[PDB]
Design a protein around this ligand. Structure first.
Ligand SMILES: CCCCCCCCCCCCCCCC(=O)O
Ligand SMILES: CCCCCCCCCCCCCCCC(=O)O
Length: 129
């Protein structure tokens, strides 16, 4: 149950640069750079549900830690990958050559995606039940 909670974005580094490189239609790139998105995570042991909302674009995802699962990326592209726990508080996966780390520390979820040399980094905070 550790990741569960509702979280809102506070600040991000390199949003625009990273969203370009991944075939994000520019309309969303500009409308998106400023949205403090909300993440809903529901964890039950290995099983994860998470929903990322950024006004009207709702991406909902589910995975089992350790299993190969379909994930829906930024662009809407669905990609087969495995998500891994590396300790109770850290989700690590790799898709379309992006290395993604999600990390809980207290009420703070830090997510970091790197495409070759670009480090897109989102920091979020818990907002209630
Ligand atoms: C203006 C209305 C539509 C809103 C469009 C928002 C598009 C957002 C684009 C990228 C946001 C997704 C963030 C990645 C998810 C994550 O960090 O795990
Ligand atoms: C749309 C991006 C795809 C998501 C691929 C990462 C899968 C595991 C990590 C997601 C768990 C919830 C963390 C989101 C927190 C945040 O928005 O920064």
């Amino acid at each position: 149950s550790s990741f569960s909670g509702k979280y809102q974005l506070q600040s991000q580094e390199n949003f625009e640069a990273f969203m370009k490189a991944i075939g994000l239609p520019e309309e969303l790139i500009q409308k998106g750079k400023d949205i403090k998105g909300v993440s809903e995570i529901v964890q039950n042991g290995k099983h994860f549900k998470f929903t990322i909302t950024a006004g009207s674009k709702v991406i909902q995802n589910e995975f089992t830690v350790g299993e190969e699962c379909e994930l829906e990326t930024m662009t809407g592209e669905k990609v087969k990958t495995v998500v891994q726990l590396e300790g109770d508080n850290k989700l690590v996966t790799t898709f379309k050559n992006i290395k993604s780390v999600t990390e809980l520390n207290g009420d703070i979820i830090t997510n970091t995606m790197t495409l070759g040399d670009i480090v897109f980094k989102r920091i979020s905070k818990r907002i209630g039940t």
